[PDB]
């Protein structure tokens, strides 16, 4: 039976968007379905800031950041515990926590 | 002599409410079954189906026993209630209890020229429980109960003498068929015929008028 109203994706009015590649296993997956997380890490680690801080010219310099949009497939985002299958009443929630 | 709780039942053991038609008129929830025993003493019960439903456990099968029981006097009141119990004593005896609390009247009528003593119903009414749909149709005299013997017994105990039956869905599902029949005989009073178009004084309940020999502090 129809498990989700929005079937697995975000497509009510297209028929077709474009596919994207899963960054784990290179599965071709539609972009509206895929699963998207934004990873904004600091460049080094939080643990290694003070070592790079003392051993640097340019005091309080920038500590830059690494941004990358990650598209997963459903098989790879479940296995990497990103979406973590919910209950029948819970899965209707559309807020991040 | 049963210590009535529930104010309406306190008036009924008193003798202040003599008719169940006054309960029906103000739509009062009968929660105590001795209200029905005293007001409708000539009441007969027929136990029909004792089907055992079963529940799967880690091991074994626990076969509880359902019951459908129709109570009714053949002057225009029946009830119907389902009792799934561990034993068929508690299925039958408490099934008669739940049958009595649901007792509702039927608006008998005429196919008819209006020569005396209503023999039939006054309206084609339907009732839908599950896939089952039951239509009851007014019928001329001597028609008998043209119904399946499940729906025939519910209408015999409601005192209908002449009625036609359409059916749909799984009438072999016995619970839904009588439940859909019960909605059909229940909607006989819900149907606004032209002789009910007269504006009525909208009276005062016994629980307002007799508010001191009820509500025993």
């Amino acid at each position: 039976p129809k498990k989700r109203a929005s079937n697995g994706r975000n497509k009510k009015g297209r028929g077709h968007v474009k596919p994207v590649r899963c960054v784990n296993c290179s599965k071709s997956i539609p972009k509206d379905k895929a699963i998207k997380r934004m990873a904004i890490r600091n460049i080094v680690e939080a643990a290694a800031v003070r070592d790079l801080s003392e051993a640097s010219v340019y005091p309080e310099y920038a500590l830059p950041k690494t941004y990358n949009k990650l598209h997963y497939c459903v098989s790879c985002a479940i296995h990497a515990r990103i979406v973590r299958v919910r209950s029948r009443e819970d899965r209707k929630n559309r807020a991040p926590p | 002599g049963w210590v009535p709780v529930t104010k309406l039942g306190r008036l009924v053991k008193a003798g202040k409410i003599t008719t169940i038609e006054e309960i029906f008129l103000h739509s009062l929830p009968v929660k105590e079954f001795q209200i029905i025993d005293t007001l409708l003493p000539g009441l007969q019960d027929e136990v029909m189906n004792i089907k055992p439903v079963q529940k799967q456990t880690r091991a074994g099968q626990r076969t509880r026993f359902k019951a459908v029981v129709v109570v009714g006097d053949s002057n225009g009141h029946v009830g119907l209630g389902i009792k799934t119990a561990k034993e068929v004593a508690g299925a039958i005896r408490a099934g008669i209890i739940i049958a009595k609390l649901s007792v509702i009247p039927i608006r008998r009528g005429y196919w008819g020229t209006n020569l005396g003593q209503p023999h039939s119903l006054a309206t084609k009414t339907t009732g839908k429980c599950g896939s089952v749909t039951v239509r009851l149709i007014p019928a001329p005299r001597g028609s008998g109960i043209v119904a399946s013997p499940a729906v025939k017994k519910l209408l015999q105990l409601a005192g209908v003498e002449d009625v036609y039956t359409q059916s749909n869905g799984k009438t072999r599902t016995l619970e839904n068929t009588l439940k859909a029949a019960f909605v059909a005989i229940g909607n006989t009073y819900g149907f606004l015929t032209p002789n009910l178009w007269a504006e009525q004084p909208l009276p005062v309940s016994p629980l307002d008028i007799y508010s001191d020999e009820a509500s025993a502090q």
């Binding site: - | 038609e21 309960i23 029906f24 008129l25 103000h26 739509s27 929830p29 002057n75 225009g76 649901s102 509702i104 009247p105 608006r107 008998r108 009528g109 005429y110 020229t113 209006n114 020569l115 005396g116 003593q117 209503p118 006054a122 229940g186 009073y189 819900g190 149907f191 606004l192 015929t193 002789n195 009910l196 504006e199 009525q200 909208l202 009276p203 005062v204 309940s205 307002d208």
Partner: protein
């Protein structure tokens, strides 16, 4: 209903909803009957003497039995300027 020889035979005339004219029937346990006491000079109870309305379960459950009673009590005089006909 009556038979041929007079004899109003019914077994019971049901009440009506005062707002939507439906039959209030023996299982409508969402249906109410409100008694509103008439009031004598300078504001007492007149015990026993009511301005009585009945609402079926449908007009309540639709959320309209508020404004049903607003209209039903305004024309009886009980309310003065709460309900306006031209909505």
């Amino acid at each position: 209903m009556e038979n041929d020889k007079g004899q109003l035979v019914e077994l019971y005339v049901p009440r009506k909803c005062s707002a939507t004219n439906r039959i209030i029937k023996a299982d409508d346990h969402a249906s109410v009957q409100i008694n509103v006491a008439k009031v004598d000079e300078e504001g007492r109870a007149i015990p026993g003497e009511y301005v009585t309305y009945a609402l079926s379960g449908y007009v309540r459950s639709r959320g309209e039995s508020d404004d049903s009673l607003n209209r039903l009590a305004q024309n009886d005089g009980l309310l003065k300027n709460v309900w306006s006909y031209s909505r």
